[PDB]
Write a protein that binds this ligand. Sequence first.
Ligand SMILES: [Mg+2]
Ligand SMILES: [Mg+2]
Ligand SMILES: [Mn+2]
Ligand SMILES: [Mn+2]
Ligand SMILES: [Mn+2]
Ligand SMILES: [Mn+2]
Lengths: 683, 683, 287, 287, 86
Amino acid sequence: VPKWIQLNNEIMIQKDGKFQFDKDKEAVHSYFVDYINQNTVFFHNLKEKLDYLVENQYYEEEFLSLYSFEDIKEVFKTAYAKKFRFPSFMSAFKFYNDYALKTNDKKKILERYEDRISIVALFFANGDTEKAKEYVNLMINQEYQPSTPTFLNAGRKRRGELVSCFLLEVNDSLNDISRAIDISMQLSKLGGGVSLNLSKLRAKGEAIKDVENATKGVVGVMKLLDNAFRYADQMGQRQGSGAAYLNIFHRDINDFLDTKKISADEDVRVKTLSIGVVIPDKFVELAREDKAAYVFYPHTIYKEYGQHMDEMDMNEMYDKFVDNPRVKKEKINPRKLLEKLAMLRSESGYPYIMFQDNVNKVHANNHISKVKFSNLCSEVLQASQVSSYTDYDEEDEIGLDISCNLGSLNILNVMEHKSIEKTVKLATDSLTHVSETTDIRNAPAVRRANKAMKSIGLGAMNLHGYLAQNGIAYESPEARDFANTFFMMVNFYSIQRSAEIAKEKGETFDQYEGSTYATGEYFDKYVSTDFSPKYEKIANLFEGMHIPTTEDWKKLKAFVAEHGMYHSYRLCIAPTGSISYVQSSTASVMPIMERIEERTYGNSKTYYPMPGLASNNWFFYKEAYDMDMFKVVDMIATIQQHIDQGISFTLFLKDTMTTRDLNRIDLYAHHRGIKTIYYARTK
Amino acid sequence: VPKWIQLNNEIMIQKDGKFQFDKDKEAVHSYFVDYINQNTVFFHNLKEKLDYLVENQYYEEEFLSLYSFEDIKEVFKTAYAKKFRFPSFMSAFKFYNDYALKTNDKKKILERYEDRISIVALFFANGDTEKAKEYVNLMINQEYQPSTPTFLNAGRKRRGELVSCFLLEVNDSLNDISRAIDISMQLSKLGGGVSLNLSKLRAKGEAIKDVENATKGVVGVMKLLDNAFRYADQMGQRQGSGAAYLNIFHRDINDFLDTKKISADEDVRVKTLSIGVVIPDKFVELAREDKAAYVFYPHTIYKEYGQHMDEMDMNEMYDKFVDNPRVKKEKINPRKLLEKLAMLRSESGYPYIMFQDNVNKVHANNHISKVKFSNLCSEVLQASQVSSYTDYDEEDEIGLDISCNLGSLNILNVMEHKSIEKTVKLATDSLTHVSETTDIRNAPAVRRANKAMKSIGLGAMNLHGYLAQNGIAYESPEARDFANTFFMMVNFYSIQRSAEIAKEKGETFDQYEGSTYATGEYFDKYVSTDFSPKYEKIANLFEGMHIPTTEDWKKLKAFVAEHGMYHSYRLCIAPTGSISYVQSSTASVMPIMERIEERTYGNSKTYYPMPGLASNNWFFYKEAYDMDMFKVVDMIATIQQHIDQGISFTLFLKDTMTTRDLNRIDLYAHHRGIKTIYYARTK
Amino acid sequence: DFTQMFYNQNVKQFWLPEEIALNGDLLTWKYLGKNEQDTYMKVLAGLTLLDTEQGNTGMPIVAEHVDGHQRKAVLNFMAMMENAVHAKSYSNIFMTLAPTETINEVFEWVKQNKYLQKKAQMIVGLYKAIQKDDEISLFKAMVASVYLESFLFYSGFYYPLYFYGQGKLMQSGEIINLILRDEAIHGVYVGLLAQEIYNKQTEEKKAELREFAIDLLNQLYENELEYTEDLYDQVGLSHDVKKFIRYNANKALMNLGFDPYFEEEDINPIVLNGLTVEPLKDDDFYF
Amino acid sequence: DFTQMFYNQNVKQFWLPEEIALNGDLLTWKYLGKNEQDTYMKVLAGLTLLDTEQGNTGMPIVAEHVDGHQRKAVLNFMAMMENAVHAKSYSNIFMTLAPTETINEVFEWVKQNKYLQKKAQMIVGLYKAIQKDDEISLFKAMVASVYLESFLFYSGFYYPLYFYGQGKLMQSGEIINLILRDEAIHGVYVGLLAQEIYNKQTEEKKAELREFAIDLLNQLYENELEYTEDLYDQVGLSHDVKKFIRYNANKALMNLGFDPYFEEEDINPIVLNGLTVEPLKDDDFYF
Amino acid sequence: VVLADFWAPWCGPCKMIAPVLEELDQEMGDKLKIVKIDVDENQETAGKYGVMSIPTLLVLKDGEVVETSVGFKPKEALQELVNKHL
Ligand SMILES: [Mg+2]
Ligand SMILES: [Mg+2]
Ligand SMILES: [Mn+2]
Ligand SMILES: [Mn+2]
Ligand SMILES: [Mn+2]
Ligand SMILES: [Mn+2]
C-alpha cells in the first residue's frame, strides 16, 4: 500500500479511545511529497507552461489572449500567494484524480489547484485583471466553488459544456420526440445531465391521426431516451445520465413508475433514465380526502381545450376534466398511488417528487410559464415553453429549455471571511459569464432560453459542516435561524447583483416586466418580515456583516423596480457531490450521511472524516440517517423560502422505517413548502 | 367451424387416394356467399358509394375529382365486366382480410376486389378515363399486381405511403445518427420498411474529436435503430421491421453479426433489426486463398483518404489500407468469417448476403454511386449518396436515399394473355405515377432521390407456378431458358417504356448522361447475344408475341441514346409474400416452399394448395427444400442478368446439410453472378 | 432434450420461507372486511390442502414411475419444494394472520367443503390408479398433475395476486408469487413428460387420450365454476376469476401439447399487476 | 424431539456443486499416476451408484412409509440431495478431470463390477421389501440405509480425503467434504427413526433385530473388503482403507443404538487432516 | 408384373430402398420386372400416377396399377406385396 493511503488508514486505528484525526494531515503531506510533486510537470516559468498548454490543445487561446502575460502571471502569483494546503487527503485525491489537468497519456499532472483556480478565474474575468484576482481570491479562499463542469472545463480545449443541466420540453409529436432524442444525445455528449418533461406526450392507447389505441405511451419514449443516453455515455468515463419527469395526473403515471420496479421485465424496464413525478396540490388534496382520483389522457384534453394538460392549473381544471365526457380518464386511488410512490422510493430511491404548487406558489416567472418539471438533480425549477419542432424544410416553433449555470458557496469559508455580499456578487458575475459564453448550436430551445432568461444557479454547501464546527446541531432551531439569515442574505445580494448587472448592461431577462420582481410581489415577505437572527449565538456568527433589514429590502425592491433584474433565476442548491471533497465541505445543505466515509479506491480502503470532525464536535456531526426527517424538512423549508429555484433534498431513511413513514415525510415536506424531493436513501 | 373453412379443410381429406382440390372452389364459393356478400354494405348506386366513402374520410377527394362521374362509373363497369372469380379460398380470404376497405369498426366490407382495382386504376391514370380502363383490365386480368402499400393505400385517406421500402445512408456523426433515427421512425410511421447503411459509421473503440476509444461502434446505432423501429411499429398492426447493412470489411462485422446470436446478451442483441452483410469480391478472394484478412476502422480511412471506406473500391484499396500504418485494422480469418456467416444463416436466417462486386459489375449508375447496401428484402440495389446532416440552423448537405416503388408481374397471367409488352409498359407507367405522387417531407434525401432518380421496381411472380402449370420443372434447363427469354422481353419493354416516358416528358433521371444507358454499355450484351428460346417447347410459349431480337435491341439502344431514360432503375423482384395469395401466384421467382401450405387463422387451419396444383402437375410443383440449390442459383442468375436491381433470393436448405453446404451455395451464387441472398430457410 | 435445462431453472429458483418477513402484513390485514378475510382464509386453505396432496403423492408417485436418472432427480427436487418449502410457507402465512383456533376451524370447513373435496379426490384418484409399467395410466396421472399445477391452483392464486396488485398483503403475496412461479415450471415439466408418452402412441390411442384430457378438463372446469361462486360472490369478483380460470386452463392444455379450449380473454389488470459446423476445405471456391 | 432441528440443519446445509470451481484441480490431477487416477475415477463412480439408488429409491421409499409431514419433509429433502446434488456433483468432477471415453468406460465398469452390483442388490432389495404398515420391514430398510450412509460410502470417501489431506485435488475434495457432512446427518437421522421402531419391540424381537443388523453388517463388510482390495491394491492402500471402513462401521452401529463391533485402530493421519408497506391513514395528511 | 419405384437423388428414404430392390431383383427378377423412374426428370409420369411422395412403389400388372406402397419397405414386405399379383 502507498504511504499516504497507509497513513489515511490510521484514522480508524483508535488510540486512547479517540480517532487519529491528525493522521489525515500527515496523509496529505505524504500524498503530495511522494506522488504529486513527483508527477506534476514543472516548467522553467509560467510562460513556458502556458505555451505548452495552449500549443498542445490543452487550453483555449481565446480566453488567455484577453490578458497580457503580466496580468496572467500576477493572477497566478495571487493564487499561489495564499499557499493553499489541502486539509484532508481525500480533497487532494479528488482534485488530482478528477479535476486536475493531466497529460494526454495520463501519466503526469499538468495542473495544480492554484493553476486550475487561476485558469477558471481568468476565464471568468474576461480580460479584467482586477476581476481575475478577485475570482482567484474567492476560489483559493474556497468561498465559492464553480460547478464540476465549469471548474473542470473552464479554459480547456478538450472539454464539454460548462452547463450542468438540460431541461427539455417534449411536445406530443413524433417529430418533437425525435428532436428530443437528438437534443438529449447532443447535450449528453457535452457532459451535462438532461431532464425531459414527458407530461405532454399522450398516454398509451391514444390516437395517432384518428386511429384509436395507437400510441404505446410515454414508456416507449422513455425507452428511446434511455438508449439515447446509454449511447451518449461520454466514453463510458461517466455514464450518460438522464431524467424523465411526468405529471402525476398523466395517465401513464402507473406505467411511468412501473419501469423502476425491480420485478419489472426487461421489456418495460429503463436503467439509465432517472424518473421524477410532478405532484400538483390537487393530487395531495384527493389523497387527503380518500376520494377516487382520475388520471387523464393528455391528448384528449389537448383536443378538447386546445392546451396541454400540464399548461393548465389542475387545482382549477381537474373538475372540468372529470365532468367532461370528451376527456378520457380512468379512476385511480390517490392514496394507493402515494403508497406506490413511497415503496418505489424505498426500493430504488425513485421517483423524484416535485410538488408543482409548492414550486409555483412562489415562482416569480409564472407569466412566462409555470414550472412543470425539474432537472436530473431535482433542484432546478424554472419556467419552460415547449418547442413545436415541425417537419423538415418547415420552420420550427422554438420554445424555452432550461440549463444549469451552477456554482456553490462554501458556507463555512463564506462566513469565516464575513464576505456573504462579496462572495454572492462575484459568484453571480461568474455564473452570468458562464451563461453568456454558453452557445449550444444543436439545442435551439436551450440556446434561446439561455440567451433570453439568463438564468443561473447559485447554491450553497458545507451547511452541516459550518453548523457542527460552530457547535450547532443541524436539527436545532438555532441552525434553522442561521440558515434563514444566511440564505436571506444570499438572496438579497443575488437580487442586488442581478439588478446591478441589469443596470450596467441596460437589459433585463426576457419577459421580466411580468415577473413578480417587477410588480414587487416577490419582495412582500422581505419588506414585511425581518429575517435577522432570533438567537444571540446565531447573531454573533453574523457579527461584522451588515444583515439586510426590512428597510434595506425596501431599497432593494425599489432598485429592482427602477433598474430591473438580469437573471430570471439566481439560486438553486445542487447536491454538490465529488467537488465537495475538493472544497473540504459537506455535500450541499444536506446533513452528513456518515461521520467517516469508507471509500474503496483500487485495492485500497480510504477513509474520509467530514471536515472539522474531532472529539469536541463528534456529536454535532450527527449522521443524516439518525436525524429526524421532519426537522431536516424544517431546515430545508427554512432555506427554501430564500431560494427562488428548488433544493436537491435527499431523504435519509432508516431500514426500520416503513412506507407510511416515507409518505409522512413527503406530505410534511409538501405541507412545509418543500418544492422538490430528490432521493430516498435507505440505510 | 365456418362452412368455407370446413370445405377448405376437405382438400387433404383424400378420396380414392387423390386430394380433393375441387373443394377449394367450393370453399371460396361458400366463403363469398356466407360471409362476404352478407358483410358487404351495398349502395343503391355508385354515386352513393363514392359520396359515402369520400365524406367519411375513406377516400381522397382529390384523385376522384379529375374524372367526371360517368367516367368513374364506366371504369367500375369495365372492372365488373370481367366478372372476376377468385380461384382459391385463400385468395379471397387474404384480400378481404388484409386489403379490402372496411368500416371504422372493421365490421362490414366497403370494397370489393373490383372496387379496390377500380380505385387503384383511377389513382394511377390521374384524369385519363381510357388509361384508367387499361389499368382496370391490367389488374382484373391479374397480369400486374401493385405492391401491397400501393394496392392497399391508393386513393385512401387513412393511408401511409405507397412506397414499400426505404434505404437510408447513415453518415459518421451524432447529428447524422440522430437524423437517421428520426427518419427511420418517420418512414416506419408511413408503413414502409427501412434499411440503413452502417458501413460509414466508425468502428468501436475509435476516436471522437481527439477522445480515443470512445465510440460504441455500429452496434450502439443498431440498438438505437432497433428501439426506434419498436417504438414506430405502426401501433401494432405489423411490427416495425428495419434493416441494417454493414460491409464485411468493417471492423464491427463480428459485433454486427453477434447481434443475431441466440447466446448474445440483451445488451448487444437486437430483435427488430434485420442484418445484412455486404461482401466485396476481395473478401471472397481472400477466403479462397486462405490468406489472413483485415477488417478496417472506417474513421482512420476517412482521415487518411478523405472518403468513407464503403465509398472506395475494396478490390483496389485493400492492399493500400493494409500497407497503410495510419489505417487501423484488426486481423480476421475470412474463411472463419464465412463459416460464421453460414452458421448464422443456418441458425437464424441472417445476415442478408450482398455481393457488392456482383452488383456493381453490371450496375448502370456507378457514376452516381456504387450500390453499397440493399433494402430490407435484399432486392433494391440502387446508387445512393450519404446526407451530411449538420447542426441546427446550419444547412444540411442532402444526398440521395433510395425509395423503391414496387410492382409485380404475374408471369402466368402475363404469358397466358400474350401481353408482356402492354403489361410491362402499363406497370412502368403506374410505378412512375406512384413515384411522382409520393412526397416525403420528413426525409429530405428520400424525397430528393425520388424526385431525381425516379427509380421504380417492376418485379415478377408466379414463375414456378407458370412453369409447373406448363409441365416445366423449375430446375430444368427449359425453365431457365423461359426465364431468360421472358425477363429479356420484360427488360426490353421496361427500357422502351422508360425511354418513351423520357421522350414524352422531355426529362431523364438525374445524372443519366453518365450511366451505361447513355453510353450504350448496358445494351452490349443485348446487341451481341440473342436471348430467344433455345428449346422448341419454350419458344412455343412465346407464340403470338414478338420476342425482341438483336436488331430490336439495337433500335432500342439507339432510341435510348436519342431520348434518354426516365427511370434510373426499373426492375426489382420483391418476395411479394402477401399479395401472392390474392393473385393466386407463387411468391416471387422463388420455388414453392410447400405444395399445400398449412395456415392457422384463429382456431381453424386453412390449407392453401399451390396455384394450379393438381394430380397431373404434382411433381412439377417440386418443393424448394427438395430442389438442388445450385439449380435455383442458376435460375436466379439467369433471371438476374435481365434485372438491373436485385432479386430476393431465399435459400431453402435441409437440416441434413451443414454450414459447408451453405457456404458452397453462397460461393456458387457469388460465382454465378447472384447479387443478393435474402434468407436461409431450414426445413 | 429438456431435463438438464429444467434442472438448471429449478435449482436456481430455490428459496426458503424465512427470507420474507411476514409480520408487516398485519398492517393491511386489519383493514379488510370480514368477507375479504373469510375468502382469503378459505382460498389459502384450499391451496394448502391441494399442495399437500402434490407433495405427498403427486410428485413422488410420478418420480417413482418415470424412467431416467436425471428426470427422477428433477422430480425429487420438485417434490422437495412442495414438502419442505411450499408447505412451510403456507403454514407461516396462516400463523401470521389468524390465531390457532381460527386456523383449525377454517381447515375443518374447507376439509368438508364439497367443491374443494370433489377436485382434490378426482386428482388423487388418478394418482392412485397408476400401474407399474403402464404408460397410459402414468400419462393420465400426468394430465391430472398438470391440471393441478397449471389450472386448479389459479382460482385460489387469484385473490392473493389481486391484493398484491393493490398494495395489500404484500409479504404473503410475494410468497404466493414465488410458489406460483414454482408451480408454473412444475406444470411445464410434467407436461413435457406427458407429451413424450402421448407421442409414443398410435393415432387411435392419441385420439382416445385427447378425449380423456378434454373430458377431465370439463369435469374440473364445471366444478371450478361452482367453487368460484361459492368463495368469490361474497366479495363480487367471480366474473373476473372465471376469466382467469379459463386463461390458465388454456396454458395447462398448451403444456400438454394440446390446442386451447377457451376463447382468448383479457385478464383483470390488478391481478396482472400482481402477476452442423463443417469447415471450408477449399475446392468449394471452385466449381 | 428432533425432526425440526434436523429440518433446519438440512436446509441450512443446502449447496450446489457449481458453487465450487474445479479447474484448480487440473494440475494435481494431471500429476497423479495412471493407477491413482484409475482408482480415483472408480471410487467416485461407486459413490455415484450408491447416491443414485439412495436418491431414486431409498430416501423416497422411507419417506413414503414414515408418518408425519415434517418427518416426510426432512426425508424428501435428503432424497433430493442424494440425486439432484450428490450424484450430480460426481459428474461435475468427472467432466472437469476426464475425457468422455474415460467417463463412458467407468460407468460401464460400475455395471459389470460384481461387488458394486452385489451391494446395490442387497441394499435396494431391502428397500423394495418394505410392506405398508409393517414396521419390521421398514426397520430392516432403515438399517440398510444407515449402513449405506455411515459405512458403505467410506471405502469411496477415503481416497478424496487422503488427497485433500496432502493438499491435492482440493476443489474436488471440498465437494466430497460437503457430501460427507450431509451423509453424517442423514445417517444420524435415519438411525433415530430405526431406534424408534426397535424400541417398540419385545426383548425377544429386539434380539432378532440385532441379529439381522449384525448379520447384514458382516455380509456387507465381507463384500466391501473384496471391493476395497480390488480398488486399492494398485495404489498400495487396501489395509489402510480397511481400518477406515471398520471405524465407520462402528459409527453406523452407534447411529442404530448398538455397541461398536470392531476394535479401535490408528487411522492414517493424512485422512484425519482431510476432515414495511404500511398504508396511509387520514391522520398522516394533517400536521 | 412390374414394381415401379418413383424416386429422387435427394430423397434419403429412396437411397435406403435402392439396395432392397437390387436384392429383390436377384431373388425374383425372373417373375418380377423392377422399373425406376426419377421424379425430378420425369414429372409427367409422376403426375399421371398421382405420386404425392417418394419413394412410391407401384405394382403394375399388364399396365394397370394393382397395389400402391408409400415410404420405405423392407425386402420381405415388398416380396409379400408383389407375390399377391404373380
Ligand atoms: Mg402532431
Ligand atoms: Mg463528425
Ligand atoms: Mn407447491
Ligand atoms: Mn408443484
Ligand atoms: Mn449422498
Ligand atoms: Mn445420504
